[PDB]
Amino acid sequence: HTLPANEFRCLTPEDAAGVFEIEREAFISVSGNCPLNLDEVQHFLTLCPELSLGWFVEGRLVAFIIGSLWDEERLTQESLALHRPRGHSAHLHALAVHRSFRQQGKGSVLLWRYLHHVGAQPAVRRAVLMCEDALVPFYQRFGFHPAGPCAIVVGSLTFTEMHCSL
Numbered sequence: 001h002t003l004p005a006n007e008f009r010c011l012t013p014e015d016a017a018g019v020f021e022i023e024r025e026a027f028i029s030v031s032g033n034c035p036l037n038l039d040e041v042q043h044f045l046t047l048c049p050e051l052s053l054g055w056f057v058e059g060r061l062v063a064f065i066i067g068s069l070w071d072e073e074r075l076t077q078e079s080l081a082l083h084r085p086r087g088h089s090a091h092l093h094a095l096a097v098h099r100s101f102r103q104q105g106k107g108s109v110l111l112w113r114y115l116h117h118v119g120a121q122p123a124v125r126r127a128v129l130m131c132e133d134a135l136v137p138f139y140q141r142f143g144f145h146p147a148g149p150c151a152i153v154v155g156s157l158t159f160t161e162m163h164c165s166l
C-alpha cells in the first residue's frame with residue numbers, strides 16, 4: 001500500500017535497468033565506459049543475486065553493489081565476466097551511489113552492510129575489488145589493503161587492487 005522510506009535488499013534481474021542508468025552517469029559519463037553493461041548485470045543478478053545489494057528510497061534504487069565469486073589470489077581480465085561457484089572471494093564488480101544522493105554516508109553504509117552480509121556466508125573468506133588511486137584511502141576505512149596495480153585493463157585508466165579479509 002506504500003513505498004518504504006528506506007529499503008535494503010539483494011537485487012534481481014528486473015533491477016538491471018535501474019543499475020545501468022546509475023552507471024551511465026557514475027562511470028560512462030566520466031570515462032566513456034562502465035564496469036557492467038546491461039547484459040553483464042543481468043548475468044550476475046541471475047547466477048548470484050545473493051552477492052548483490054541495493055538501497056532503495058521511496059521505491060527507487062539509489063545505491064548498489066554487484067558482485068560474484070572468484071577463486072584466485074589476484075583479479076585478472078577473465079574474472080571480469082566470470083562467477084566461480086566454488087570461489088571463496090567475493091568480487092565486487094561495481095559500487096555506485098546515484099548522483100543526487102552522494103556524500104552522505106550511503107556508500108559507506110551499503111559497503112559495511114555488504115561486507116557483513118557476504119561475510120555471513122562462511123564460504124566467502126575475502127572481498128576483492130579494483131579502484132582508482134584516489135579511493136584507496138576510502139576503502140582502507142573498511143579493512144581493505146592496497147594490493148598493488150591491478151592487472152585488469154580498461155581503456156587507459158589505472159586501478160589499484162584492494163583485498164579485505166572477512
Ligand SMILES: CC(C)(COP(=O)(O)OP(=O)(O)OC[C@H]1O[C@@H](n2cnc3c(N)ncnc32)[C@H](O)[C@@H]1OP(=O)(O)O)[C@@H](O)C(=O)NCCC(=O)NCCSCC(=O)NCCc1c[nH]c2ccc(Br)cc12
Pocket residue numbers: 026027028030031033034035036092093094095096097098101102103104105106107108109129130131132134135138154
Ligand atoms: C565512491 C562512491 C561509491 C561513494 O558514495 P558516497 O555515498 O558519496 O560516499 P560517502 O559514504 O558519502 O563518503 C564518501 C567519501 O568517499 C570520497 N569520494 C567520493 N567520490 C570520490 C572521488 N571521485 N574522488 C575521490 N574521493 C571520492 C569522499 O571524499 C568521501 O570522504 P569524506 O567523508 O572525507 O568527504 C560514490 O562517490 C560514487 O558512486 N561515485 C561514482 C562511481 C564510483 O566512483 N564508484 C567506485 C569506484 S571503485 C569500485 C568499483 O566499482 N570499481 C570498478 C572499476 C571499473 C571497472 N570498469 C570501469 C569503467 C569505468 C570506470 Br570510471 C571504472 C571502472
Ligand SMILES: [Mg+2]
Pocket residue numbers: 156
Ligand atoms: Mg590513447
